Structure 1
Amino acid sequence: YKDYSRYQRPRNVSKVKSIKEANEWKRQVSKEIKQKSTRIYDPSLNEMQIAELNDELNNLFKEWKRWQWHI
């Protein structure tokens, strides 16, 4: 149990533990990857907002690289 839907990233990638555990933290990145990718193409017109959202994407996608790097 213990969900993985509660906690944070956790910040350092190398400090995470056995491979069956970081697998679920990894998909705990990919959903927000999926969610905010759908939030890219929206015609909602806020160009300043989608710029900071674009930076958050690039941040999370770099994390997704790092979780794959640890594995």
Structure 2
Amino acid sequence: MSRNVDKANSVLVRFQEQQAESAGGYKDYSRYQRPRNVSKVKSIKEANEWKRQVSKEIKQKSTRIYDPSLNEMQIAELNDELNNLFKEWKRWQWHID
């Protein structure tokens, strides 16, 4: 399990995380992938967390896309990615509450 990722997703760590989730309510919304279809999330806190995560992602995307080699295609691709992120964020701002 060299290079840290393996360590992170080693069974023991996972178990610990699960335990934390069970007792006290420590989740790491960084750690899990954000769900595709909203309205399968009855809790508000979770939703908020997800929204926050997406915002963070968007910010990250923004930070990188103004790099100096602007003509490279990665940046262009991200522009679409950025849009997608924005859309997701908007969706997360649903009007149930």
TM-score of the alignment, normalized to the shorter chain, above 0.5: yes
Q: Which runs of 5+ in 1 are unaligned?
A: none
- 2:19 paired residue number: none
| Deviation (angstroms), 1:70 | 5.1
Greater Cα radius of gyration, structure 1 or 2: 2
1:47 to 59, 64, 72: 72
Residue pair 1:14, 1:70 contacting (<8 A) in 2 also: no
TM-score (norm 2): 0.66
Q: State the identity as a percent.
A: 100
Would you say how many aligned residue pairs link Structure 1 and Structure 2?
Answer: 71
| Deviation (angstroms), 1:46 | 4.4
Task: Say which structure, 1 or 2, has more relative contact order (CA 8 Å, 6+ apart).
Answer: 1
Secondary structure at 2:93 match in 1 = helix
Quote the RMSD (CA, aligned, Å): 1.5
TM-score (norm 1): 0.86
